[PDB]
Amino acid sequence: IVEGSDAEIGMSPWQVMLFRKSPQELLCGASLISDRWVLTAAHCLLYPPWDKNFTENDLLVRIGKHSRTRYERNIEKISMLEKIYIHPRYNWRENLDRDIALMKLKKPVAFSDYIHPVCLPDRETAASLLQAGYKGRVTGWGNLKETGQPSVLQVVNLPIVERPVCKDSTRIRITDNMFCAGYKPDEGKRGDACEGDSGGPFVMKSPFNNRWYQMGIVSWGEGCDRDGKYGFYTHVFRLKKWIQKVIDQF
């Protein structure tokens, strides 16, 4: 996270670290959506142009963390993967359309002060909250700059951007399954996700019921925190029918 701040303890208890087994390293962010299911970006798991194709046995999920590098004894929980499910129409060839994946954990994780699932939006949630200028929150242990690494989880709040502005910022084809967020050059505030943060959650606190909802997944960008560029996020509600289908089936 570039131009963010340290998270408070228990601020993002749904935050998940995807951790490569060998070499030991941060792969991506993710989120906890139930005792048994974690949500992330498909590109965290499958991106053939860079020869990325993880199997279940290649990574671990670390839940309840604050420190990036420490083993947070008696606090974090380490979980193994039972199965990975990538959206079947994820478009890794072109523009990362439908950049979403689910992971089922081998065993259910116990909730605690530090570990608690985020809500997924329904249609009404999305309509109310996905509006230009409304701010959401992005968290992660990724790089602090485009070109180092944080001691603890970072957070930044960022406004949703008007679709034409998003479309005009990039040569990449934007779809309805994406939204963008970030400050404009003229706004004076800064902030973005970066390498290490992808797959993590973009969340909003509903002012109607005071619950946190995962509205996006950190999907892609061009550089990090560049003027006139915006981060792109997978639109979770637009893909909820697929999420439900997977959870219902498996």
Binding site: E8, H116, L129, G133, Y134
Partner: peptide
Amino acid sequence: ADCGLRPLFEKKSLEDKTERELLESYID
């Protein structure tokens, strides 16, 4: 049932340091 309600915040009626920024942006 309790999704999205943080044990160290909403469950105990404490607010984090920047959630008010989010609220203030929810203007419609």
